[PDB]
Amino acid sequence: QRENKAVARVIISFLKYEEYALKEIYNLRVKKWASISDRQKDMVPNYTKYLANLKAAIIENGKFFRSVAEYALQSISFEPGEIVQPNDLDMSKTCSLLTQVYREWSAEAISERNCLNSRLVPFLKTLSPPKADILIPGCGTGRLLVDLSRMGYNCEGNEFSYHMLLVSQYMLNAGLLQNQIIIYPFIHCFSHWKKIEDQLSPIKVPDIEAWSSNKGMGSMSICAGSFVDCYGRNQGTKISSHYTFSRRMQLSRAKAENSKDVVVTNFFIDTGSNILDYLDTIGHVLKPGGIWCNFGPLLYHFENDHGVETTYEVNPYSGFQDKINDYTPLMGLELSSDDIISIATNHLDFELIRRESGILCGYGRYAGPESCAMPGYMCHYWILKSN
């Protein structure tokens, strides 16, 4: 399937991390050291030992990605035609998974995760029914699904990146022991260091032990696909790259209507080319009286993207696609916090329940005692209730 071609590319990308990282961050720095004058070499006498340590760290990270790949390979059978090589974007995504894994599965990143948990968890425990059905769009490798399902909620994550999905199935189902894996997730960042040894900091993952998903006590599932495709409205939503009209997705959207008690968007609401599709989908999938909790920045992903996609409408009489627009820009609709909440309250029958602005929180941020990494984002937080 097309799914299998994508998965193959990601698995090969995992297997090739070491070679790519050596080429990308190691080789030219050996060449740079070699090219400076002996006089300048003496100013940095430990540079070559540093580069040896950086190479060792790359090899360890390669061991992690190889283990994830082998785990995926125990359950996927290809075709000769379905094995396609990864491009450079695949390799960069694989390198950034180190940051994602640090963020979602290390003890050092606990406070960064507590920005959201410290606000959402008290609210859920006191005012929302465990057990409840919670949907988590753009769930990443799925830490939040573990935390919430361990409180007894039925948690469905949604994720369209196969990089994320493959790491996710590894971290959730491989039976990892607490602190089993040592990775070096900061070695691709060469900036902001007070002490260079911090860049080579070892990080143990996962920071939590395995716990069973038990029927009737909080489960986990995942829609692999685009959010709007999996759960969108079945009428009135333009078809695009992120919205298809095949029978499968029409059925998934039909069963998705009023199916969730809670939607939690966490660094997600700003990821799309049309946030209004996201708002429509949240209102569709939530029951009356359900709550949408959002936490994260408003850093619009396509703000500088001048690409265009193709959009259509579904003809009511024929059911066929119609009203073709092949010049639909990806940029646009970069809405403010106030306008998102105002659209929800005045057009989608929501009532504002909680709101906080300017919550400084990092994303995969180095958190050591002398950290000077980029401080993070000013995050917006709100809870709206459908009615």
Ligand X SMILES: Nc1ncnc2c1ncn2[C@@H]1O[C@H](CSCC[C@H](N)C(=O)O)[C@@H](O)[C@H]1O
Measured CA to CA in angstroms, residue 92 lies from 10, 21, 88, 95, 346 at distances of: 11, 9, 6, 5, 41
Contacting residue, 133, 159, 261, 280, with ligand X by CB under 6 A: 159
- Taking the complex as a whole, how short is the minimal distance between the CB of residue 242 and ligand X, in angstroms? 5
Q: In this structure, what DSSP letter does residue 313 have?
A: E
DSSP structure string for 222-275:
EEES-HHHHH--SSSPPBSSS----HHHHHHHHHHTT-EEEEEEES-TTSSS-H
Does 270 interact with ligand X (rule: CB under 6 A)? no
- Taking the complex as a whole, how short is the minimal distance between the CB of residue 258 and Na ion, in angstroms? 4
- Per-residue contact flags (x/-) with ligand X for residues 134 to 153, judged by CB under 6 A: ---xxxx-------------
Does 103 interact with ligand X (rule: CB under 6 A)? yes
Contacting residue, 149, 271, 281, 311, with ligand X by CB under 6 A: 271
The response to whether 327 counts as a known ligand-binding position is no
- Per-residue contact flags (x/-) with a second copy for residues 225 to 254, judged by CB under 8 A: -----------x-x----------------
Q: Which does 306 bind (CB under 5 to 8 A by kind): a second copy, Na ion, ligand X, none?
A: a second copy
Alpha carbon of residue 167 to chain centroid: 11
Structure tokens at 222: 């995942």
Which residue is closest to ligand X by CB? 138
Rounded to whole angstroms, the Cα distance separating 301 from 144 reads 22
Question: Taking the CA of residue 259 as centre, how many other CA atoms within 13 Å lie in the half-sphere pointing to its CB?
Answer: 17
Q: Which does 192 bind (CB under 5 to 8 A by kind): ligand X, Na ion, a second copy, none?
A: a second copy
The response to whether 103 counts as a known ligand-binding position is yes
Q: Which is nearer to ligand X, 58 or 116 (CB)?
A: 116
Question: Total number of residues binding ligand X (CB under 6 A)?
Answer: 19
The response to whether 278 counts as a known ligand-binding position is yes
Q: Is 367 exposed, middle or buried (0-12, 13-18, 19+ CB in 10 A)?
A: middle
The response to whether 242 counts as a known ligand-binding position is no
Block residue for tokens 């009023």: 258
Alpha carbon of residue 226 to chain centroid: 12
Q: In this structure, what DSSP letter does residue 80 have?
A: G
Q: Which does 258 bind (CB under 5 to 8 A by kind): ligand X, Na ion, a second copy, none?
A: Na ion
Q: Which does 161 bind (CB under 5 to 8 A by kind): a second copy, ligand X, Na ion, none?
A: ligand X
Does 350 interact with ligand X (rule: CB under 6 A)? no
User: 47-73 vs 162-173: helix axis angle to the nearest 10?
Assistant: 80
Helix (H, G, I), strand (E, B) or coil at 308: strand
Does 262 interact with a second copy (rule: CB under 8 A)? no
Contacting residue, 61, 149, 154, 161, with ligand X by CB under 6 A: 161
For residues 281 and 254, the answer to whether their CB atoms sit within 8 Å is: no
Closest among 110, 89, 231, 269 to 161, alpha carbons compared? 89
Region of 56-64, 130-138, 177-185, 338-346 interacting with a second copy (CB under 8 A): 338-346
Does 61 interact with ligand X (rule: CB under 6 A)? no
The response to whether 268 counts as a known ligand-binding position is no
Does 343 interact with a second copy (rule: CB under 8 A)? yes
- Taking the complex as a whole, how short is the minimal distance between the CB of residue 257 and a second copy, in angstroms? 17
Rounded to whole angstroms, the Cα distance separating 118 from 129 reads 18
Angle at the Cα of 383 from the Cα atoms of 234 and 361, rounded to 5 degrees: 110
Does 373 interact with a second copy (rule: CB under 8 A)? yes
CA end-to-end span of the chain: 41
Structure tokens at 173: 């189902």
Does 43 interact with a second copy (rule: CB under 8 A)? yes
Question: What does the binding site for ligand X look like in residue numbers (CB under 6 A)?
Answer: 103-104, 137-140, 158-161, 164, 226-227, 242, 266-268, 271-272
Binding residues for carnosine are 270, 301, 377
Give the residues lining the site for a second copy (CB under 8 A).
24, 28-29, 31-33, 35-37, 39-40, 42-44, 47, 190-196, 198-199, 236, 238, 270, 274, 276-277, 279-280, 297-300, 303, 306, 308, 311, 313, 325, 327-329, 331-339, 343, 347, 357-358, 360, 370-380
